[PDB]
Prior knowledge:
The structure holds two protein chains of two kinds. Chain A is an all-beta fold. Chain A is built from no helices and one strand. Helix content of chain A is 0%, strand content 25%. By secondary structure, chain B is α+β, with helices and mostly antiparallel strands. Chain B has one domain. Chain B is globular, with a radius of gyration of 18 Å. Chains A and B meet through strand 1 of A and strand 9 of B. The site of one magnesium ion has 3 residues of chain B, from loops.
Amino acid sequence: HSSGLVPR
Amino acid sequence: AVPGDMVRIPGGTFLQGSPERTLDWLDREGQAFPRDWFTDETPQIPVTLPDYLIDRHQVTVAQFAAFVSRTGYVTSAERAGGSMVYGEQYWEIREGACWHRPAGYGSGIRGRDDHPVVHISFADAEAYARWAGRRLPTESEWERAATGPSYRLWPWGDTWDSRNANTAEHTAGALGDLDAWRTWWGAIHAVQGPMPQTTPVGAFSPRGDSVDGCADMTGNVYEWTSTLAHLYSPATRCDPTIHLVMGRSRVIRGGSWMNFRYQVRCAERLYGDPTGWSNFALGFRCARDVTA
Lengths: 8, 292
Ligand SMILES: [Mg+2]
Ligand SMILES: [Mg+2]
């Protein structure tokens, strides 16, 4: 899992 | 000895972040996100920096290629077999997507080697910077180079102008209204045609440059910094999804071609997973101590 870009 | 591709930022103390009146302004604009999406820019804090150097331009495709050619470096995305592209509604993994296949298998970088390189992970960016004899900017060095020695919304000042950078404001304005822009968004993802809508580095110079000479600090691609996500005060309160990445993500700055004016401000903060993740709109530039 990856938090990616935050905030989304 | 300032390298020709860098600019010297004069040392000084500056107010990092956004004043409350800017967040009040955002609350009253016609834009979607709640105030606690912007409180991570608050409160403003005094930040003292020496003279330092920062790249004029984002690292380009040509420049990254020469690094790969000379070292054999394999990027996170290539090791993982895929990377993120923005589809019709959400970010999605696209097999084969990487710096030289920006939209996945079936795409290439033909004739865009002066565009910013994308699908760069945090480690890719640090590997390149290290090979170049440089490093990533810190978040403070990035913002100071964007806003200049006094507070401004965008590098050129406080008045928006869609001609000054590569953002969705230009596209939406060109199509006449946001509804037509929304229709266009749908069509171009059915056409499946193009993907990353980057522009050559320095295309909007001088009008969109910062006071010290940096180009594309607004829009085009997101940029990694070396700074670990942190709040400017222990009492600042933001959306819980923001708190969740504090002390874990690295800060990403400058917004992208996909953003409108409010998410490309000098002080806008964004956060990225530094463990290998990347996307088709995320690049970087380098910085360096004056003597290193
Ligand atoms: Mg940007
Ligand atoms: Mg933000």
